[PDB]
Structures are given as C-alpha cells and as structure tokens.
C-alpha cells in the first residue's frame, strides 16, 4: 500500500496499492487521526491496520488448509477473503460465514437418517464460536 | 425491379406478343399511376411545407385520387 | 468436375489412383486401371450390401447388422468362395438345416 | 493426436441409399464393409502386377487389371465385373 | 460556408489586359478592381516590398449562391520570386473555363497550392486580427478547437483533439504578454508544457475558429463571404521557396 | 395477405422517377405507399378489368395520365426499355 | 405462481437462431446436443445409444455443420426449441467470443456511504429474484460462472404476449439482459442498456441482495467497458485496481521474493542497469546516433508507458486497451483558470501515444501520469495535480 | 456437330481472319444451319481475330445488332442475347465513334457498349458535350438499369479527357448516387481462357497486330 | 393531422427543459 502528499495540504492521501477492494484501505485512510494523516506513527497505524486485517485473513485459510491436509474435512471451496466456506466433512456437507477469528453463522445442508431437526439444531449451534475450537469439536463430532 | 418485371409482377397476379405488349402496357399504367400517387403527394407536401414528403402526404394524395377517379 | 461423377461412379477414383501409387504395385499407371477397378469394387460393394439388405428385409428391421452381413456372404455361393477365408466379427455360424 | 482415416463409409452409406432408401447401417457393418473394399482392393492390385511382371511389361493398365479380376473372382460374379468395369472405362474415355 | 481554393501563377500576367477576349470567350463582362494594400504593416513584420497589388474579378450572373457569386481574387508583387497566385470559390466550372484562358493566354503554367501545419496557425493568427480606422490593430477571439489525425499501428490511437474556448486563448495571451499572434507565442507552448505535446510535429488536419472559419489541407472555409488581406498575404508567402 | 409488393422494389422504381421528379420519402412514407399499392392495384382492377389496346387507352385517358394513343405510346417510350416500346409500337 | 419451468417453448425467428447457430464448432455441437436429448428426449424415434451412433457415423464421414444444424432445427425439435436451450446458446456464444459484447460497472454501497463488500449464496439470490420480477413480467433467469474467472453470471430475459395473431398462444420474446458479481467486491457488472426493463431488472437485483440492510447502485463509470476479463481486471477484486499504468508490477509482485529465499541468487547482490535523465529542455531544438542508448531510450518509453523495462503486457499494445478518454485540465494562471480539454479515440489510445513517443513526436519527460494511462478507464478532472473521477 | 467441329478445329489453329469473322457472323445471322445455343459459344470460342478488328468488318457486324421496328420489319433479327454476347466478344477485341454511341443506346446492350465507346474516347478531340445528352437521357429513362452505372462510366471518362467544357460534371451527380452497377462497369473483365486461347492465334504466324 | 418525430419538434423539448433550468435558477436571484 502507497500513500503521497497533497500539494498544498502537507498530508499523505491515498494513491496507489494493492489491497484487495474488500479491504476498505481508503476508509481506513480516513478514519486515521481524522483522515488528517501526517506523521509516521499515524502511517503505522493505518498499515498495522491493514496488516491486521491481512492476517485475519491468512490465519482462517491456513486452520482450513490444515483441516483439509489431514482429511478431517473432504473437499471444499473458498471465497476470495476466506469468510464465506463450504467443505463436505464425510458426506455431511457445512456452510460457513465467519468474522475474524470467529463463526458467525452456520448451516448444515445434508439429509440423514441420524440427522433429526433436533440433532441439526444442536449440531449448528455447537458450531459456532472461536474458531481454534472448530478442529477439536468437530473431530469430537466425527460422529 | 424492371418495368417488364413490374409486367410480371402484373401477370403473377393476373394469371403470345400480343399478351406480351399487353401487359408491358398494363405495367406502363400502372407504373404511371404510382408517380401520380407520389407526384399527388409531393403537391400535398408543397401545401404543408416542411422539408419532406411526410406519410399522410401519400395519404392524401391517395384519396384525392380516388375522389377524382 | 470429379473423376467419379464423370465415370458415373459413386466411389472415390483419385483415391484408387493415390492408393495404387500408395501400394507400389508398378512404376507406370494405365489411367483406365483405377477407374476399373473402382467401378469393380463399386459393384461387389454395392451387391453385397444389397444381399444384406434383403437379409435385413427377411429379419424384419431396417438397418444392416453383422449377422444380416455374414447370413448374405455365407448363404451367397459364389460370395461364399470370394470370401471363404473370411470370418465377419459378431457374424456367427448358418445352421445345419 | 490422431490422424484422420481413411474411409469409404460416406460411398457405402451412399449407394445404400440408392439401393433402400429407408435402411440404416450399423457402426460394425459399416467397419465390415469398410474393409471390404480395400481387402479387394489389394487381392486384385498385386495379382495384377504380379500378372504384369509376367508379361515382363512396365505398365499395369486396364488389360491387367480386367484379367487380375476374372482370374481372382468366382466366374458368376466375374462376369458382372468385367462387364462393369469396361463400361464404366468406356464412359470415362468418352468424356 | 464559404469555400476557397488557391492555386500559382508562374508569371505576373497583367490581367486587364485580356479582359476582353475572357468576357467574349465567358459570353460575359466580369468586373475587375485594382488595390495596392500594405498588409504586414506592423513593425516586425516589415514597412517595405508590403506593396501587393489585388484583384477582384467575379463571375456574378446572379449572386443567389457561391457558384454565381464564385469570385476570383488574383494578389501579386513584383519582387516576388513566383509573383503571383489566384484563389476562387464554388463548384461553378465557369471557373476552370477561366483557367484554361490564363494558361493557353499568357503562356502561364500553374498548380494547386498545399499548405503546412506552421502555416495553418500563422494563417489562424491572421483570421483572428482586425484593423480599426485609426491604423490600430485589435484581436477578436474565438473558441479555438485543434483537431488532429494520427497514423498508428493497428489504428491505436485514430484521432484526439484539444479544444481551447475563448477564455482560455484570451487568457494566455493575456498571461504571455501583450503580443500579436497568440497561437504561436503562448498557447502551443502552454500545451507543449502540459503535455510534452508538439503541436508543430503532430499530424495536423484542421484547425477550427467556431462561428468564424475553417483552414483545412487544402481549403479556407470562411464565415464572412470574403477574406481579409493577411490571409492572402500570409498565403502569398507561403507559396515560395 | 401475398398482395404486397416489396418497400425496397418501390424503391428501386421510384429512385429512377425522382430524377424526372426529384420526391423525398421518409420510412413511415415508404410503408404507407406500400400499403395503399393494395388499394392502388385493386382500384386498377376495377378500372382494368381486361386488356386490349383501345380498352387501354381508354382507361388511361380516363386516368387523366393522357389525352389520347399518341399520348399513350409516349408515355410506353419513356416508361419502357427500347426494343419493348418498338414492340408495343407494332402492336398499335 | 408465474415462475416459467425449463418445457416451455418460446416463439421467435427461424433464421436468426439458424445464423447464431452457425457460429458454433462441430463437437460442441454434439455435446449440447447429446445432453438436450438426454434431457428432453426429442422426436427422433430411437435410443440415446442410436442416437449416438448416428450422430457418430455423421461426423466420421466428415459432414458439413448445416446438416446437423437443419437435422436440429427440423427433424429433432422441429417446432421450436426451449428457453433452457435459447439461454445456452447465447452462453456459449459469449464465452466463445467474450470481445463483442459491452458491459458497464456499477458500486453497491450502504447507508453511511462506505462501500458494500456483496457476499452471494446463489440460491437465496435466484429464488428472491424470481419470486420479486415474476409479480411484474414473465421472467427466465439462468445463472453460470464464467470457465476462467472468479465472477458469477447472470442471464434476466422478459416476456409478454401478443401484428396481430389467433389462438396460437406463445410469448413473443426480448432483447436479453446480463450483471455479473464478483466474489468479494463492491462492485457489478452489467449490460449497457437504458430501455425500462433494464432499470426494472437492476432494480430488482438492489431490492432483492439486501435481507438485512438497505443498499443501493451508484455508477463510476459514464462509457462503458468490452471484455468481461478487461473490467474484470480494472475494477474486480484484484491487485491492479489503484496499481494501473506504470505502477502494474506492485499487481504482479514477482520482482520481489520471499525472505528466506537464497542469498547469492537475492537480486540486491546483482543488481540491475537504467539510463540517466536530461532536464534540460532540448526536445523541441532537434543519423549521428548509435545503438545502446537508443535501447535505453526505447526502454525508458516502455517503462513509462508499460511500468516495466520487460513490458508486461507488439510493443505497443497495453494491459487493458482504452478507446476512448476525456481530460479536462485546471490551471490557474496570473489568478485566471484556464481550461484545456482533450479527446482521444482508438483503440489503444496510450499505445498510441506511446508510438508518438518512439517517433519522437512528444517529450516522454513531460508527460503526465493521468496522459500515460494511470486511473485506467476513468475520464476525469484534474485539479492540484491530483486525478479526480468525473461525476 | 460436325460443322461447329470444323469450325472448331480451324479457328483453335488457323484462327479466324478478318473476312473470315465477316463470313461466319454473317453465316450465323442468316442461316438456320447454326444452332442460337451455339451462336452464343461460337462468337466468345470461335471467333479469333488475327489482330485488331478492321472497320468495315465492324460496320458490317453493326448491321446485326440492329432491332426490327414498325419501319424495319423486313430486316433479319439476330437474338438480343446473341446480339448481347457478340458485343461481349467485341469488348474482348474515326466515324465509328459516332456509330458507337447509338449502339449503347440498346438496353440489352449498353452495358458492353461502355467499353468500347469509352475505347473510341480515347483523344479529347473525339469526345463532345452534345453526346452526353444520348447518354444522360438513357440514364435517366426506366428500364435501363445498365445505364446509369454505364453512362457515369462514359461520364467519367468524358469529364477528365474533355479538359475543356461546360459543367457537365454536376449531370453526373445526377445519375444514380448508389453506383452499384458501375463497380462491376469499371473492373470489366476480359475472358482470360478465351484470351489464352487467343495469345496463341496471336503468335502462330505474325507479329505487330 | 400529421403524424411525425423529428427536427421542428425534438428540440423544442430540450430548448424548454433549459429554460426551466434557467428559470429555477433565475428564482433564487436576489433580483
């Protein structure tokens, strides 16, 4: 991420970057010290934000990644930031929504014998929380 | 599109010189009776004033024509 | 205009021409020799898919199998000692009586 | 990859339709008469030139190969051959 | 609406004498006026050889059209290495009749006249100025638009204009100074300046005053029906080598 | 309906016609006089109902276009391609 | 209630089909036709299997593609094809030449004006949508997701009945409409069309991607954009948006690797050459000249106009080539603003340029970032040397 | 077939003089022993002049591209088709510039008069501004569809040969603006078989005609 | 009547959404 000065201003503005437009790096800009960035301390803290933000988004890829590399989870496929996620556990398949570090939201797709409303509900309700937690509950809930 | 295909048009529509000569002489009429319509119509179209010979110009022209023939 | 359409024939006669230059059977090339032979092998294709057509007829359906093919070569005497070496795949055997 | 093959398949299918219409042809039939006509076409050519050798003359021509065909055929059908292919000769030298 | 083309003259051919022998060969009498201008009256521009002769001779039957109104204005000087061209208006092929006089006359050869794009801002300079009663100079000002049509590979880059209303040209020449011809003392280099731009190098095609003229490759189109003596003059100079 | 005749063949003939008399036609034009073309021919038909040459001329100095067969066999000269209105002229 | 189903079977011009048809190859001709009747069945009598081997024993004698076309189009489905069927064509017909079709984009933003990231579920969004368009027109949608990129796609077409005609009963149909939606951006991508039903549809998607709180479209763009992979690339979600121009290899991010990677190979060891610059304003003053730094001068023209000394992408030809581009300078001189508007038109505009320079028509030196080609695709003002989209 | 072989096998080797063309065109007008669907082959196959065809011989093939009329009933008609694929052939190969122009007024015709017409226009001395009127009227008239296209051609040669004259030039804006018969007019096209053909009957014996 | 939408109708809708563009603003004049 690239930050100049206005001309007249003597403050940084926003030029050029390669954060990913989902990342609001313009907001952020702005929020900083009222938008009226001028010292390097302000400029760590804008990219210390981003950074943040960055690895809020490598740090769920990575859990899913491992998830997937031990075959915990069969198959699956990730939107670009990682916060919406859809994997097939053994033949029960998940849908996930997920802030950083946490879920948010879940839901169960499949149909099986086992799987009552009851058993669901409790199944996607125990599904939410911090994520560190998912890989151990879900192997507990293998079955 | 000829005026003897305009004769054959004539004669698609209606059904040997001398029914040759005469159904080129039945294109010939009736070929001058449309650049009547249209000369018809340019008159209307001198009456009104704009640049061009608008539809109900033809119109016109049209029932002018009937109404004299 | 094709040699074929001017012979009258439907089968390829450059591609007899080509092939016997394929086949290197002779240096010199009569130019009625592979209009011959097409015609020839015209008409042993055009018999033997008329006798199995005919044996398509006597089975009832109308497209040519193995079976109606290797019924027509065996039955047909003289088909029979043209190709009397050959045995048709899915063809099968003609019975006893 | 896969080169393109040769083929007889579109004549045969052809002259089918010109002897019934309405019939069809099976993909192992089509193969079958397929090979047909090069099998014949070989047992006709090499007996030929082989005929020709004999004579100890250069050019295989329509002599050669009107006489590799009734040599090799059953007569019945030999007949029906040579006649075929001296008419179909002719009509071409008449173009 | 007024078109022009512009051709040379190889000879200072006194054209009243034979006026009469193109009226019977026009089966008309045209007219033919007589002014010795001093067009580059200003300083820099010189005091001296600014005696050019004009002519104006029309083909006026009528004047309903610029065929029938198609005048032709012939401007020369003796000092001058080719010492005379000619300019006419309109499609009327009376026109080329009168040509084909000059030339199996005076045994005159002659040839169509082209111009460059340095001579296409010095003759847009020359539109713009006008003269008061009092031999003062004043400059009206107009929308300049430069229009341009460049050859690319794989036709990248087709055609691009800059348009430049009055403001704007009044302002620069303004900021230059007081001068005389704006397009070639402050405008081309403010452009340049802001662009890396050559308004000199670049293909140009035409150059447009709106509401006041058109100078093309070719031809003057002009909003008033005739054209004042710098144009001429500045054409005159141009012809030369 | 097979009646109608084509806007573009109207367009041919008449293209030919406005050089005698230059008319200008915009599109909803162009449709309207091929739809009243119907109405032209059927008019016709009732005028015309058989060819010969006095009916003919007939008709079309009651159609106003001419006055009489000297009239008539000028307009087939400058309505017809050459070697037809010598034919005709044989016919009269 | 008046959702349509895939049987049903629309009314429309033989030919023009016919004429859209043609442009398909052979085999994709088959496998679409392969799966219609595995699907649907036709009026051919036979099995998949028989129809397999005509179709087979069609292709190896080397038959020609209107054989097949006219055996579709009147033997097989002789009355007319399903809207299912009319849908796919124009699918493959884009993805088969995605360059002649237009598209213009579009930013969802929220209440508080910051932008709205669109995060999409396909089946919420489809059912919605259905369910919202059918209480107004007649409404097919089909939905697919481009083979090559991350962007889901959208086909919305209208219907209504019934010139003059009797009981024959079909829905004549309309000119189509397209959106796109990346996976994780602000930003949409639509058809270029301004007629009712268009503003209808568009509506339509605003209303219905809520579900918890409002949202609305605001365009950024007034020309539109060819190419689905070029607006892809400006405005998708992706490294060159905002590093466009001299600035793209930031976007490619391979000059630089990782930390770890080996010492002797780290390119600080190595090292690398470029040319030096003249201030000095000899251009417009004036082969005597010889080969090296002529290639550093080519290359300083490419860096300038490309952003690298290897031209990431002739040597002309841009990233994401610009038709056209209106600049509107304000500078204030001796306290008078003056305006200075340009227009430019092509088909590379910046390549052009770029050609300009090489032939030494303009100064490489003064020219700005806004003339090389950075804010890709924006027409705007600039003002205090900074670039400003117009409104 | 045996005489059209004899004329064959002589004009595909001795070609075919000039009294010889004058002979057989005359043959072919006044005789039933040629067939017309081979009249119209042996003028375009047959006929293979030595060289540069004379004038009385034109003049004399003129007299077969006349038309009967309600004066010359008595006159033999060669088929216009026939009499339009002998001025086809003549196309392939200083009075007669005024006979020429009467010649494109024929509307089966016109369209291979326009070359050599314009072939007579070859001097600005030969062209007058009166022909034009012959031309534009053609042009203007219904049932020509040739002429317009035809006439801009003899048009165009007229206004930059002529180099003296009135404003003729904007007769030609007249004439049909779309020209989409004179793109074919101005690129005619020569026969190159029968041309090839003809090379050799040029060669056989003589050079310089 | 005639039926017709082209020049001599298609501007004066422009010329008078521009006048009442004028006119609007000419309101808030202080005279």
Redesign the interface.
């Known amino acids: 991420v690239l930050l100049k000065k206005r001309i007249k201003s003597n403050s940084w503005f926003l030029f050029k970057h390669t954060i990913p437009s989902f990342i609001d790096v313009q907001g952020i800009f702005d929020d900083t010290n009222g938008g009226l960035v001028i010292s390097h301390d302000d400029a760590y803290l804008f990219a210390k934000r981003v950074f943040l933000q960055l690895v809020e988004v490598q740090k769920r890829r990575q859990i899913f990644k491992d998830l997937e590399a031990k075959k915990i989870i069969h198959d699956l496929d990730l939107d670009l930031e990682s916060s919406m996620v859809s994997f097939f556990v053994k033949d029960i398949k998940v849908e996930l929504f997920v802030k950083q570090n946490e879920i948010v939201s879940c839901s169960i797709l499949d149909d099986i014998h086992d799987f009552s409303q009851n058993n669901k509900s409790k199944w996607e309700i125990a599904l939410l929380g911090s994520l560190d937690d998912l890989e151990l509950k879900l192997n507990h809930s293998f079955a | 599109m000829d005026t003897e295909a305009l004769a054959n048009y004539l004669l698609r529509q209606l059904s040997s010189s001398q029914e040759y000569n005469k159904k080129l002489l039945l294109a010939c009429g009736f070929q001058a009776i449309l650049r009547k319509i249209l000369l018809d119509a340019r008159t209307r179209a001198t009456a009104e004033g704009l640049r061009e010979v608008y539809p109900y110009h033809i119109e016109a022209a049209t029932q002018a024509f009937l109404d004299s023939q | 205009q094709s040699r074929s359409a001017k012979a009258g024939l439907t089968f390829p006669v450059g591609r007899v021409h080509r092939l016997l230059r394929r086949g290197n059977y002779a240096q010199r090339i009569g130019s009625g020799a592979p209009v011959y032979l097409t015609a020839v092998l015209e008409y042993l294709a055009a018999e033997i898919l008329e006798l199995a057509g005919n044996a398509a007829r006597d089975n009832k359906k109308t497209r040519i199998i193995p079976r109606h093919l290797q019924l027509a070569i065996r039955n047909d005497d003289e088909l029979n000692k043209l190709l009397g070496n050959v045995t048709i795949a899915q063809g099968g055997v003609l019975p006893n009586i | 990859s896969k080169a393109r093959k040769e083929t007889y398949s579109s004549y045969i299918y052809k002259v089918l339709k010109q002897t019934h219409p309405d019939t069809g042809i099976s993909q192992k039939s089509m193969s079958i008469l397929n090979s047909f006509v090069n099998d014949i076409f070989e047992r006709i050519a090499t007996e030929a030139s082989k005929l020709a050798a004999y004579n100890k003359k250069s050019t295989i021509s329509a002599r050669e190969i009107q006489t590799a065909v009734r040599l090799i055929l059953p007569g019945e059908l030999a007949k029906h051959a040579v006649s075929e292919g001296t008419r179909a000769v002719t009509k071409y030298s008449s173009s | 609406p007024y078109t022009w083309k512009f051709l040379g003259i190889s000879k200072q051919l006194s054209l009243e004498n034979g006026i009469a022998k193109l009226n019977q060969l026009l089966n008309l009498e045209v007219d033919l006026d007589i002014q010795t201008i001093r067009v580059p009256s200003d300083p820099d521009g010189g005091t001296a050889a600014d005696e050019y002769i004009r002519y104006e001779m029309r083909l006026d039957i009528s004047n309903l059209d610029e065929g029938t109104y198609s005048k032709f204005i012939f401007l020369g000087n003796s000092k001058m290495e080719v010492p005379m061209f000619l300019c006419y208006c309109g499609t009327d092929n009376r026109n080329e009749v009168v040509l084909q006089w000059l030339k199996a006359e005076y045994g005159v050869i002659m040839w169509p006249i082209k111009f460059e794009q340095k001579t296409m801002i010095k003759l847009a300079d020359a539109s713009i100025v006008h003269v008061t009663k009092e031999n003062i100079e004043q400059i009206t000002w107009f929308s300049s638009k430069l229009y341009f049509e460049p050859e690319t590979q794989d036709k990248n880059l087709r055609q691009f204009s800059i348009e430049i209303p009055r403001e704007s040209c009044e302002g620069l020449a303004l900021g230059y100074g007081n001068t005389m011809h704006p397009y070639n003392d402050a405008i081309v280099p403010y452009i340049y300046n802001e662009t890396g731009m050559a308004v000199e190098r670049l293909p140009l095609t035409s150059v447009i005053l709106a509401g006041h003229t058109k100078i093309m490759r070719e031809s003057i189109v002009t909003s008033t029906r005739s054209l004042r003596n710098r144009v001429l003059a500045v054409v005159l100079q141009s012809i030369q080598f | 309906s097979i009646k109608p005749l084509q806007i573009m063949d109207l367009k041919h003939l008449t293209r030919q016609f406005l050089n005698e008399n230059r008319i200008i036609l915009p599109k909803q034009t162009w449709s309207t006089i091929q739809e009243e073309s119907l109405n032209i021919m059927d008019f016709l038909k009732q005028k015309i109902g058989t060819l010969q040459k006095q009916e003919l001329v007939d008709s079309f100095i009651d159609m106003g276009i001419i006055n009489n067969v000297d009239d008539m066999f000028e307009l087939a000269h400058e309505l017809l391609p050459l070697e037809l209105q010598s034919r005709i002229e044989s016919y009269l | 209630e008046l959702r349509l189903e895939d049987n049903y079977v629309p009314t429309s011009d033989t030919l023009v089909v016919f004429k859209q048809l043609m442009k398909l190859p052979v085999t994709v001709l088959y496998d679409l036709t392969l799966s219609w009747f595995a699907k649907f069945g036709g009026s051919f009598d036979g099995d998949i299997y028989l129809l397999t081997?005509?179709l087979?024993?069609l292709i190896?004698?080397?038959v020609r593609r209107n054989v097949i076309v006219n055996r579709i189009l009147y033997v097989y489905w002789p009355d007319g094809l399903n809207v299912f069927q009319l849908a796919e064509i124009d699918c493959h017909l884009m993805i088969s030449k995605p360059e002649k079709f237009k598209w213009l984009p579009s930013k969802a933003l929220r209440g508080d004006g910051?932008?709205y990231?669109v995060?999409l579920?396909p089946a919420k969004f489809i059912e919605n949508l259905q369910t919202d368009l059918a209480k107004i027109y007649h409404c097919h949608v089909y939905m697919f997701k481009h083979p090559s990129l991350?962007v889901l796609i959208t086909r919305i077409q209208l219907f209504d009945s019934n010139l003059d005609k009797f009981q024959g009963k079909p829905l004549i149909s309309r000119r189509p409409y397209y959106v796109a939606f990346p996976?994780?951006?602000?930003?949409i991508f639509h058809s270029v069309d301004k007629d009712i039903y268009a503003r209808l549809v568009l509506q339509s998607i605003s209303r219905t991607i809520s579900e918890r709180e409002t949202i609305i479209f605001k365009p950024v763009q007034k020309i539109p954009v060819k190419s689905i992979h070029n607006i892809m690339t400006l405005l998708?979600?992706?490294?060159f948006?905002?590093?466009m121009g001299p600035?793209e290899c930031?976007?490619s991010?391979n000059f630089e690797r990782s930390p770890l990677h080996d010492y002797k190979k780290h390119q600080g060891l190595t090292g690398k050459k470029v040319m030096v610059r003249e201030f000095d304003d000899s251009?417009?003053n004036d082969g005597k000249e010889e080969p090296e730094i002529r290639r550093l001068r080519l290359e300083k023209n490419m860096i300038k106009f490309k952003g690298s000394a290897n031209g990431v992408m002739?040597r002309?030809?841009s990233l994401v080539?610009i038709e056209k581009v209106g600049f509107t300078?304000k500078?204030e001189?001796?306290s008078?603003?003056?305006?200075?508007?340009?227009?430019?038109?092509?088909?590379?505009?910046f390549?052009?340029?770029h050609?300009?320079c090489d032939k030494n028509?303009?100064?490489?030196?003064?020219?700005?970032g806004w003339?090389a080609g950075?804010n890709g695709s924006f027409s705007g003002t600039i003002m205090?040397?900074?670039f400003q989209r117009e409104q | 077939k045996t005489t059209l072989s004899l004329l064959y096998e002589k004009s595909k080797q001795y070609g075919l003089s000039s009294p010889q063309l004058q002979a057989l065109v005359r043959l072919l007008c006044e005789t039933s022993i040629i067939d017309t669907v081979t009249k119209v082959y042996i003028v375009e196959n047959c006929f293979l002049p030595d060289g540069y065809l004379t004038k009385e011989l034109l003049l004399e093939i003129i007299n077969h591209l006349g038309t009967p009329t309600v004066f010359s009933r008595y006159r033999i008609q060669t088929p216009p088709v026939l009499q339009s694929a002998l001025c086809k052939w003549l196309v392939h190969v200083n009075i007669s510039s005024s006979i020429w122009l009467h010649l494109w007024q024929f509307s089966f015709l016109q369209k291979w008069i326009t070359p050599l017409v314009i072939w007579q226009a070859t001097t600005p001395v030969d062209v007058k501004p009166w022909k034009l009127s012959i031309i534009k009227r053609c042009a203007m008239h219904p049932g020509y569809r040739d002429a317009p296209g035809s006439a801009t051609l003899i048009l165009q040669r007229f206004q930059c040969l002529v180099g003296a004259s009135s404003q003729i030039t904007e007769s030609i804006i007249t004439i049909n603006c779309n020209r989409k018969t004179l793109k074919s007019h101005r690129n005619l096209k020569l026969d190159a078989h029968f041309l090839s053909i003809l090379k050799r009957i040029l060669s056989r014996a003589h050079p310089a005609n | 009547k005639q039926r017709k939408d082209s020049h001599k109708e298609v501007e004066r809708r422009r010329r008078e959404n521009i006048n009442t563009a004028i006119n609007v603003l000419s309101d808030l004049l202080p005279v």
Not at chain 7, 236 to 239: H, L, Q
Not at chain 7, 361 to 368: A, T
């Open positions: 081997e005509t087979d024993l190896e004698k080397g910051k932008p990231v995060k579920q991350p996976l994780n951006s602000p930003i998708g979600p992706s490294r948006a905002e590093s600035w930031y976007a991010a251009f417009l002739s002309y030809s080539p300078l500078n001189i001796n008078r603003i003056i305006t200075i508007k340009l227009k430019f038109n092509g088909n590379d505009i390549g052009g340029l050609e300009l028509l303009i100064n490489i030196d003064k020219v700005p003339l950075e205090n040397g900074d």
